[PDB]
Structure formats: C-alpha cells, structure tokens
Amino acid sequence: MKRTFQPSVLKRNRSHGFRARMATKNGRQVLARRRAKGRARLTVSK
C-alpha cells in the first residue's frame, strides 16, 4: 500500500529547506522560534 511519505530530497528542500524558510517572513519567524527553543537541527537541511 502506497503510504503517505514518499521521500524526495529536492522536493523536501524546496518545501521545508533553509532558503525556503528564509524567503518569507513567516518562515523566518519559525526559524527564530526554533533557535530560541535550542533546536540542534534548525531546518530539514542536512
């Protein structure tokens, strides 16, 4: 059965990657939030 997650690196990066997050305001805020929390992996970026 085709399960929901069907990985694709490029698609992952474009969707969720660092630059994408940077591009828009809301993404930047998300980034800031994650930094505040102390996340080790700020983004999906490997």
Q: Which residues bind RNA (CB under 7 A)?
A: 1-11, 14-15, 23, 25
Shortest Å, Cβ 11 to RNA: 4
Dihedral sign computed on CA atoms, order 32, 33, 38, 40: negative
Residues 6+ apart with CB under 8 A from 43: 16, 17, 18, 21, 31, 34
CB of 44 to RNA, least distance (A): 10
Nearer to RNA, 3 or 41 (CB): 3
Q: How far is the CB of 13 from RNA (least distance, A)?
A: 9
Q: How many residues does the chain have?
A: 46
